[PDB]
């Protein structure tokens, strides 16, 4: 199960916000979220399970950031983005998102692991500007 991954347990020891998705199910829904994640977003575990994590996006979320994630998952690439996300109550925060595939011995992606770090506006501002400049 989700907590049997050694890196999941590792992340738990620092109380990091993370989710696990199951890409073998249509639309790659979340199948575990840490307590940190549930508190950040304002949802109960049972509510988040079964949803694709795009439910944290909204009108001011940059579609180009979201497309970086989609492509990374498509192309088999680790991805890190900063993007605007939305809590259950509609209030927003900046989310630095770290995504990687968890693979079996043949390279088949068995789950995705996604770590979320809430970051300040100023940090998001500077990260995105550096991203854009470096690009
Ligand atoms: C989540 C974090 C997250 C973790 C993991 C493991 C996955 C697989 C996805 C996500 N989120 C992105 C979303 O699931 C989807 O991949 C993207 O929207 C890209 O595809 P679409 O163009 O939407 O079809 C998340 N997105 C968030 O905004 N916030 C999160 O916490
Ligand atoms: Cl997805
Ligand atoms: Mg559910």
Automatic annotation (TrEMBL):
Biological classification of the source: Eukaryota, Sar, Stramenopiles, Ochrophyta, Chrysophyceae
Annotated gene: OdAUREO1
Binding of FMN, residues: 52-54, 57, 70, 85, 95, 116
Protein name per UniProt: Aureochrome1-like protein
Domain (PAC) ranges: 77-131
UniProt organism field: Ochromonas danica (Golden alga)
Region forming the signal peptide: none
Record: residues binding Mg(2+): 46, 49
Domain PAS: residue ranges: 4-76
């Amino acid at each position: 199960g989700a907590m049997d991954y050694s890196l999941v347990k590792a992340l738990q020891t620092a109380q990091q916000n993370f989710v696990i998705s199951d890409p073998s199910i249509p639309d790659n829904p979340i199948v575990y979220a840490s307590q940190g994640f549930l508190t950040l977003t304002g949802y109960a575990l049972s509510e988040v399970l079964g949803r694709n994590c795009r439910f944290l996006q909204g009108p001011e979320t940059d579609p180009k950031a979201v497309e970086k994630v989609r492509k990374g998952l498509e192309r088999g690439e680790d991805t890190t983005v900063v993007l605007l996300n939305y809590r259950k109550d509609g209030s927003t925060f900046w989310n630095q998102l770290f995504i990687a595939a968890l693979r079996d011995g043949e390279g088949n992606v068995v789950n995705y692991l996604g770590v979320q770090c809430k970051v300040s506006e100023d940090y998001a501002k500077a990260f995105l500007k550096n991203e854009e400049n470096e690009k």
